[PDB]
Amino acid sequence: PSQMEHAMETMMFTFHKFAGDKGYLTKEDLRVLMEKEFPGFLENQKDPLAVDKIMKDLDQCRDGKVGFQSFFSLIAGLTIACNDYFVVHMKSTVHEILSKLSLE
Amino acid sequence: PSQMEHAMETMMFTFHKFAGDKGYLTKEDLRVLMEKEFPGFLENQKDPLAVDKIMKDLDQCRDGKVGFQSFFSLIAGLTIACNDYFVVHMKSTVHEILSKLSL
C-alpha cells in the first residue's frame, strides 16, 4: 500500500468505469467523462466545444474510439500544465487549479 | 472534490516531494523515488540496474535532470502496461500488479 500505486490504481479504474467491455471512449464518452469526474475545469472553461476540440486533439486517428494510452495523455496535458502552475502561482486542490488556467 | 482530481493532486505532489526547489530529478533521485514510494516493483524486479537503464530511457537529453513532463511519462509506462493486464490477467492493488509484469 503506497501513494503513487494508490493513485495509479484510481487512474486505471477511472478509464473502464467510463468505457466498459467496449474498452474505449467516443466523443460522447469523453464529454460525459470530463463531466462525471472532473467538471471543475471544462465547466468554467471558455468554450462549449472544448470537449469537441479536445476529443479531436486526442484520437489522432479520427475513428471515434480513444484507447487508454491516448487517454492517459489527456490525464497528462492537464497535470503537466497544472504542474507548471506551481513554478509560478504557488511555491481536491486541482479541482480549482484546473478550472483556472487553460491553453489552446 | 473528486477522484481523478484527488489523484492528479497526489501525482502533482509526488514529484517535488522527491525534487525540491531544484525542480527536477537526477539518477540518484529516481532510484530513491521508486524506492520511497512504489518499491513494490523495482524490488522484485529482474535487475539491480533497472533504475539506471530506466533513468537513461527517461532523460532523453542525458544531463542528469528529469522534468515533470518526462517524469509523468514514467508514471505512464507503468500504468499503461499495467492497464493491459486487465485486458488479460483479470476481467493498493497496483502494489502487486507492478512487481508482476516487466520488460
Partner: peptide
C-alpha cells in the same frame, strides 16, 4: 514496460 516519450500535452 517501455517508458517512451508521450505525444502532446496541452
Amino acid at each position: 514496460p517501455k517508458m517512451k516519450i508521450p505525444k502532446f500535452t496541452f
